[PDB]
Amino acid sequence: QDLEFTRLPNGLVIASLENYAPASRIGLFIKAGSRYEDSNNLGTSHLLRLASSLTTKGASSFKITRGIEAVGGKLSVTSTRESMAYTVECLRDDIEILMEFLLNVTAAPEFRRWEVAALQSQLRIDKAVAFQNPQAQVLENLHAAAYRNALANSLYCPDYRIGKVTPDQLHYYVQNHFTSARMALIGLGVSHPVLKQVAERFLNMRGGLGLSGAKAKYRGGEIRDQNGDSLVHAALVAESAATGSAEANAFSVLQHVLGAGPHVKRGSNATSSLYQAVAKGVHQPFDVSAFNASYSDSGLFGIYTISQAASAGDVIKSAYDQVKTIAQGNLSNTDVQAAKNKLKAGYLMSVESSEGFLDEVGSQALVAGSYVQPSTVLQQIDSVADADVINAAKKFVSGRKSMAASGNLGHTPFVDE
Amino acid sequence: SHTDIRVPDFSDYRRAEVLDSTKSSKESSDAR
Amino acid sequence: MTNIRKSHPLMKIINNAFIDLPAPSNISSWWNFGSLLGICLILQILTGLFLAMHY
Amino acid sequence: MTNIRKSHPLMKIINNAFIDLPAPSNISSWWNFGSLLGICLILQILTGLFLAMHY
Amino acid sequence: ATYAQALQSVPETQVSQLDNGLRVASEQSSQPTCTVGVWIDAGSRYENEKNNGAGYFVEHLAFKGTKNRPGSALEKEVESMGAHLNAYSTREHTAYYIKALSKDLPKAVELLADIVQNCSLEDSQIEKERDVILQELQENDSSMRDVVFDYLHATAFQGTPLAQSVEGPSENVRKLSRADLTEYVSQHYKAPRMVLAAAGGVEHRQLLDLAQKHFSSLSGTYVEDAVPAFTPCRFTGSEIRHRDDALPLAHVAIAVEGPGWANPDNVPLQVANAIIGHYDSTYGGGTHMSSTLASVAATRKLCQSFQTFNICYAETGLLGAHFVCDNMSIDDMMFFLQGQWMRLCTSATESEVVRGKNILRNALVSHLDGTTPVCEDIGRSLLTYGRRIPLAEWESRIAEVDASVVREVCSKYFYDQCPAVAGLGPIEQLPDYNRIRSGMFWLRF
Amino acid sequence: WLEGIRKWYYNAAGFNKLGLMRDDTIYEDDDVKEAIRRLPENLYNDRVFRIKRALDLTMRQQILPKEQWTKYEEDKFYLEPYLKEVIRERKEREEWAK
Amino acid sequence: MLSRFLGPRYRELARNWIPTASMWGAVGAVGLVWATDWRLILDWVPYINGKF
Amino acid sequence: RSFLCRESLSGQAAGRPLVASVGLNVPASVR
Amino acid sequence: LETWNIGVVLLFTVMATAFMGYVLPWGQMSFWGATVITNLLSAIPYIGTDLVEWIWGGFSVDKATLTRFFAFHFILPFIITALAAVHLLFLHETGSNNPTGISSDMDKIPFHPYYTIKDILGALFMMLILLILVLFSPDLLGDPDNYTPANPLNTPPHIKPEWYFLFAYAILRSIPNKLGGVLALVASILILILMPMLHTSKQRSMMFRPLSQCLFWMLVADLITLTWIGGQPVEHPFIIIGQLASILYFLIILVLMPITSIIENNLLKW
Ligand code: HEM
Ligand code: HEM
Ligand code: HEM
């Protein structure tokens, strides 16, 4: 009836909450992502994410697929730049079965040569599907043009590695990035004893911490792209802060102060300062929003903009000017309070869904290692003062920039201007 | 637009049973 | 795994010749005689054999 | 311009049949009895006809 | 705690009814958030040709302004507490819901009352709103999935109001007026067809007392006497083909007349539908998925996005599939997909029926996760069924259906029934309607 | 004893004279296509040679000299580990079919 | 044609297609007696028998 | 999809880092 | 598979054609062999009797039988040609089988320059033997009694079918039961259809199967023994030799070859 953390001697923090829900979700979160990829194994993480049904040590691909389908389960491998989350959710009197299916695919894989070779083609399909939305390309180019190494690595395999990701790279990546110390097993709707039983039964296979990655450095590039789509997706960011600090909370509050996104369908973002500031000016279809991306060792605060090709030069300008206003103390406490309310609501509403709560617990366990109640998170959010937001804005303004743009970039202003 | 298009009226060709817009064709499907 | 109509090597030619053969939509009755010849030939083969039975 | 052997319908069929058909090199003499059968059949088709015209 | 015990817990959906007709219905479990919204029963079904598209326009102008909240001030409030106000308008139901913290429940219901009762409908916003819809119509024109389902409804329920699109033809939206919208609001936004709903930290007593002192002004009478009645629709098995070779893929949708909301045959048929399942080229299951059609498609790379559907209106529905494949796959897929249906109509096996039951159970349970889906379920169920079906009852119905029941219901709905195919794009291998109807029966049987 | 009989049979079999290893004489059924496709590149590349050379001897209807014959002790079972895996997968699929 | 075809699903499929196959055999039998004009059946029949 | 008005653009501007996800019986998604 | 089934059909129809053609010249042997062979069909229960007059066209092999046999013997070889075309059609989709059995897709050579001349040589070599047959000793393969006007009043002292049918006649006269004889006649040829199923050796080629090779040559000797026995009249010791040869032939095709293949595979780690 409550959350229960447990750090076994080999790390591997175990969390479980018996919510008595008709369905239970077991998710294993691993501190292994693109940032831990090196210059020679680029795309390995993407292949691993695409390899969630390959023949494991104790369960052939046919058995895994057929069993999970027969009990009616989903095996998601939700991945970030710094974490990969396996997840299976099914009815209460089934999880045991798929529990094994989750573990064999995460700690005892085989990576058979034929299966990997056949799966290599799926990398192109996934990249093409995921790159239809322009934001994917822009965000990947942003990380490439902002971080020198580590975080710069894309979540998707570069086209020059499609078909050349040998299974040996997969085995090395698993052995050096799936050790017990860097993983967290979370279970919603399952009792803690059985979770501990399966953990110490099999997940103890790979002890240790593993090959640590390298801290990402901030270059400040301007990776651009003239792809020809009418809308110009531009994004201008700067090194904000690492998550888990007062600076991170202040930047998160600043995001809602400027603008977080739509709240009323068929609205106008009247409260959002960025949208209204740009609205005076560009009288054309457009959208703007503050962008906060907090990572384990660094972070990025900036502005994302989608506007008409010709008008883009105004938007990226006008929106930026708005942030400049917040820099030299042009912010009222009422806006701070509204942003705090929006942020608290957004946090308490991400955890609404059971899967969202599972992701929250997984992130807390992987990064911090000690879950904290939403109430204390609200206290931390409230603890931010106006001067801290004003700073944060100063740090963003007087900091090395990083721009990424895609579209007809004829009138897109350059990072120097 | 997709909304603008519509099926032209076929009332000249329909069988007697399926001719009104309120009845259901399931009743007379077996007959036809 | 695949329709026998378009999988069997012998069925390939029959399907492509009489089942899924793209034919003009506005073909008049004057083209029906193309079949009428062939069918008629079979009768001439069918009858003509039986005449050869007792001859 | 296209080679008539591999473009004309009848020539295409004959070409795939017994012109450019990929056959094993170590085919022994015992496979010859395939073609010979047809040959005798052809001869059997032929001579019988010339018998059938005086029977 | 096994599955059954968790199903029993299932906090209840206490339902009440104030005098004017509006029925409140809440579901409180623990959560500090809430999703409070009304579910006015209206849509393209209750719309004649002259005013087809009024409902979409009304939903567009709902949040723009009110008599109480002048203009964008309503948006200012909604964003002040961080609420995410939203609205969706199907062919039968049109709903407004606010996703907000439970503490701000008193304000949210007041905001809902203002939007759904005291709407200005001001002329200038109508003119500005006109451009948005027209552009939205082009966006939906590019929505290569949506146009196919619109074609399905147009070519299946011809003549009937169901064929009418939700947005409306791009000629009524250019000739509408405050008069036409005001009649729509007066004739449809009435208390009997309104389901105030909430889920989360919402005490049912709270919702009731708030409804009495905010929504009691809603009337139940209908102008002079005019009451928009129910016009039953007819399923005219037909075919529509919009051949457009420029489009890369070829969306095709085929459906037969499936049951209505009240018909219990939904429970077996869904299981049968779950048998065929769904697939996308990025699934990862590949040639190992238990669904035969999915395994074939992944093995031969036939489709990209085939998926079954069970669109079900009040008295009739559409039951079938929608597949997206290249130009030279349709002729094959119409062979396999139909070839699957007949198999279910002739040789359904309890081995796969158990799998279908499990998939249906997981779909029902997972869909009811989070406050907003719960509120959607409450608002939709009080209208379609008249009561929120508890998950225990769903479990009982799923337990009843077996191989014989699935075979019987598929034979009663699928076998020998004229389809309602609808193509788009480079559809040329798409077999002629005679061929499609030919596949609807198996000569072995 | 058995091994003597298997010696005699291997000597009298014939594929030793042609340089063919034991797993080269498999009749290719539906599973053996997948077995061959599953082979690593080096084994595939040696197998295609061995087969082509053997077909060369047979078309000339000659044999290799005694020295270049595959001995019983030198007959690797390269295909068998993949063949048994393919068979096991097929049997698993058949069991699931019931 | 071995233990593969023997299983609970195959037995159930047999049961499912037994009525159809059996009355297909009935179709074949009726067609055969009709085509052959089999007296040894047709005599026992009603009105048909008056042909002879 | 076509996006050519002020409204439909709203929500397209991402404000959080990209997160990709694929499954076994669910399609690939990004955020 | 399909090529093999089509080949079995070709064998059936060509043997029927040859029987009818041999009936055509209307010698004593022709008429009497026709009577015996058609009368064999009486063994079938119930409707076996009625087929005999239907095929006969009357109450005995007479005018109608000869005329209709001429007609069928004329038409059928064109059916043989059609089935042979389908045979080749089916063969092409997989390609010919080399003596080694293993797939030779890495060694295929074009047909036109190499095998056209090889089959020219083969056909000419066959014509050599055929011309020795026709030109030097024409009636070497055929009963001299055929050169006698057929008379339905005097059975010839020696009764046999042609040299290519005596082998089946041996099994016919082996089984005392008439219906058993006809069933054995059908089965002697139809047993080729069971051969693809009975193959249990992991090798598809008989080059590397010594024991099976000895079995195959024993089968060939069995067929030649059946032919010779069919030539001889049914007396001691030909009767028991015929029974033993029939049993041995069926036993080899059905049992010895599969058991030999199984012990074969056991002998080679598979
Ligand atoms: C191309 C198709 C054919 C045509 C146009 C054709 C035409 C004719 C004609 C006009 C006659 C004269 C009939 C009479 O005067 O009474 C005839 C007779 C005959 N035909 Fe054919 N015939 C054909 C096919 C065949 C075939 C395939 C056979 C053999 C199987 C055959 C066997 C005979 C025989 C035996 C006679 C003589 C008996 C008689 O006069 O009817 N015919 N044919
Ligand atoms: C399939 C190939 C054929 C075979 C195996 C075959 C076989 C035979 C045989 C064994 C005889 C008996 C010869 C004799 O006793 O003197 C014969 C006679 C005859 N065949 Fe054929 N035949 C074939 C094709 C044909 C064809 C296509 C025709 C018709 C064009 C034909 C017409 C005749 C005639 C007229 C006779 C009687 C003349 C005679 O017996 O000398 N045959 N055939
Ligand atoms: C009407 C007489 C026949 C003709 C004209 C004929 C024609 C042919 C030809 C030309 C070939 C290719 C050459 C070869 O491989 O031998 C062939 C192959 C073949 N035929 Fe026949 N055939 C006849 C009878 C038969 C019979 C009676 C059978 C057995 C039931 C049969 C089964 C085969 C097989 C299995 C092959 C493939 C041989 C291989 O792959 O090595 N055929 N046929």
Numbering used by the authors:
A (entry chain 3O): 22 to 438
B (entry chain 3R): 79 to 110
C (entry chain 3P), D (entry chain 3C): 1 to 55
E (entry chain 3N): 2 to 446
F (entry chain 3F): 24 to 121
G (entry chain 3X): 1 to 52
H (entry chain 3V): 47 to 77
I (entry chain 3C): 110 to 379
Text lifted from the article:
CIII2 transfers electrons from ubiquinol to cytochrome c (cyt c) and contributes to the proton gradient for ATP synthesis. In addition to the apo form, we resolved four distinct Q-bound states. In states II, III and IV, Q10 takes on the prevalent conformation revealed in our cryo-EM maps, while the Rieske domain undergoes a stepwise movement from the b position towards the c position, eventually making contact with cyt c1 for electron transfer in state IV. To further analyse the detailed conformational changes among these states, we measured two characteristic distances, one from [2Fe–2S] to Q10 and the other to haem c1. Our results indicate a possible sequential progression from state I to state IV, characterized by increasing [2Fe–2S]–Q10 distances and decreasing [2Fe–2S]–haem c1 distances. On the basis of these observations, we propose a model that outlines the coupling between ISP movement and Q-binding states.
